[PDB]
């Protein structure tokens, strides 16, 4: 399974309130939690929390992550939302409305392989 440190560090109600707070303050931005898939052949990420405009695409968000972890261009990266790889052409706003957690955050896992899910 995916075990999210964000959810282990904060109660459901804490996250519900905080997600609602940023969405009220920044209605055109989506709060994203990013964590590495356990065991993956990829470096862990230093920045876990992102507030990204809804107008960037999934491909663009992947680029942001790749750059954060200094992943070489020739080396692949896969994102997973609820165990499926999202389509790169979607906007982060579309992804958020279709996959947001019960707590109002969007949880995106990343890996160097797509053996984890669909």
Residue numbers in the entry: 0 to 117
List sentences quoted exactly from the publication behind this structure:
In this work, we solved the apo structure of GABARAPL2 to 1.9 Å resolution in a new crystal form in an attempt to co-crystallize it with an LIR peptide. The structure reported here shares the same P21 space group as the published structure, but showed a different monoclinic angle and is not twinned. We collected diffraction data from 13 crystals that diffracted to resolutions within the range 2–3 Å, with the best diffracting crystal, with dimensions of approximately 5 × 50 × 400 µm, diffracting to 1.9 Å resolution. All data sets belonged to space group P21 with similar unit-cell dimensions, and the best diffracting crystal, which we discuss here, had unit-cell dimensions a = 28.4, b = 58.7, c = 69.0 Å and a monoclinic angle of 98.3°. Despite sharing similar unit-cell dimensions, with the b and c axes permuted, the structure that we present does not show a twinned crystal pathology, which is likely to be due to the change in the monoclinic angle. In the new crystal, there is a change in the orientation of Arg28 that allows the formation of a bidentate salt bridge to Glu12 from its +1/2, −z symmetry mate. As Phe117 of GABARAPL2 forms a dominant crystal contact that blocks LIR peptide binding, this suggests that future co-crystallization studies should remove this residue to enable new crystal forms that permit LIR peptide binding.
